[PDB]
């Protein structure tokens, strides 16, 4: 088992291939996890999503990087078998973006904030092929998001990064918070290095306004978990102000 | 103020002071926290103990750096101006020992494991001047650590590693568990790459069973818990075998 020292600990039902995890979440929604290695410290999983929409796949994060993103296409195609229509990536750090060149190798259409893809270069990551923008009370555009299907993406305002987005799934129970929400048993907001602390707490709750039925609330560094984690990261960001 | 990306934040009653933060437990027991900034990742915070005894100061775990370490002791200069007698290091790890040469160079006797000095060069950490060691039922051999008046010393078995060490406050409803103890509402164990993952359930077990008096249970990257850390380590660990 790999177990690490940030993130959700292997459980019945988890699929190992080769240095990544898969967990079902729903008939038709997986939660994809890789591993960084950091010396000294252990490893750290970070969480994204592969949606099936009918004939095709959509992709939420790559992992954290090339070759790893590489394993979870391989990995689409070989137990999923459907092509991956496009994918997202909710900010420009490495445990969402590190793995942007395996998509654009494998011909994946990409899409991200396009205030990710101005600060992409800035972080030494691969800027996605399409920018999303969004409406003033933050759900993106719908001319920037073609045949998005169930993907319902939301820019909640800063928090995490200036730039975090964060994805609905339609037809399901599901929101994804990416690494602006944190657990409900949290005792911290992960790095705030490039936080704004000012607006963190009114973008969590935003989020989870914008999906107000969602259950299950998955996010990068542990297991799903209830809308308290929403509610405990915002307490958690009010003490940040 | 500092937001750890890793570690308790801060609360009321917290005193800053250099790039560490201080907060007194009882009329004669204080925390000490410092931090270590890793690029990209953000600040680890690591929690040691100061311990005011008659008519001298105990200090248990360095600081991550000589130069942290230094800081803690113009604190203890500054706030308590007692001589400092000794100060025992919990194992052989960064966040405990990394700070050895500032004790020395002070002129502070200090304290470790035996089998935490013969890892300390393997582990790129400086040994302490004086090995403990420890009976059967794990209780420090007293000898061996001569002067230590209210602090009871504790190796409760393999668990976070091979050597951790606890430390026990006479007088006090204080006990120390380090890296072994996690806090009551973890994910994780942290880094277990060190773990005995077999033994560490009786470990954390045998930790609480030594110190029944311990009502607040310090640890290394939590702020203080009640009894329900040891619980809740215990069951996250035998989860392991
Ligand atoms: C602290 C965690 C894991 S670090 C990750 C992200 N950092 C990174 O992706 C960064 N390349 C990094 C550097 C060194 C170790 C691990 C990761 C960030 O800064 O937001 N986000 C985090 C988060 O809080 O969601
Ligand atoms: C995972 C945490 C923080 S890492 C710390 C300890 N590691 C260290 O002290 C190590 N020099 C380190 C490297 C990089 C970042 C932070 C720390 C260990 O391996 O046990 N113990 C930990 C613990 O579980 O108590
Ligand atoms: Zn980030
Ligand atoms: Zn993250
Ligand atoms: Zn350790
Ligand atoms: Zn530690």
Chains 1, 2 share one sequence.
Not at 159 to 171: A, K, P, Q, R
Not at 187 to 211: P, Q
Request: charged residues 15%.
């Amino acid at each position: 088992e790999i177990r690490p020292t940030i993130g959700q600990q292997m459980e019945t039902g988890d699929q190992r291939f080769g240095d990544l995890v898969f967990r079902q979440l729903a008939p038709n929604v997986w939660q994809h996890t890789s591993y960084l290695d950091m010396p000294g410290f252990g490893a750290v999983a970070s969480n994204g999503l592969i949606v099936r929409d009918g004939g095709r796949v959509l992709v939420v994060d790559t992992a954290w990087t090339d070759d790893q993103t590489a394993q979870i296409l391989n990995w689409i195609k070989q137990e999923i078998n459907l092509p991956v229509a496009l994918a997202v990536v909710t900010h420009a750090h490495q445990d969402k973006m590190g793995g942007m060149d395996a998509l654009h190798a494998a011909g994946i259409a990409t899409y991200a904030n396009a205030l990710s893809n101005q600060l992409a270069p800035q972080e030494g990551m691969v800027a996605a092929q399409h920018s999303l923008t969004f409406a003033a009370n933050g759900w993106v555009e719908p001319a920037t998001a073609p045949n998005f299907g169930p993907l319902k993406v939301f820019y909640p305002g800063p928090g995490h990064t200036s730039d975090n987005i964060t994805v609905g799934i339609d037809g399901t129970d599901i929101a994804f918070g990416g690494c602006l929400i944190k657990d409900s048993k949290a005792k911290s907001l992960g790095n705030l290095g490039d936080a704004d602390t000012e607006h963190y707490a009114a973008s969590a709750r935003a989020f989870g306004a914008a999906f107000p039925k969602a259950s299950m609330i998955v996010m990068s560094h542990s297991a799903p978990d209830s809308r308290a984690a929403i509610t405990h990261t915002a307490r958690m960001a009010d003490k940040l102000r």
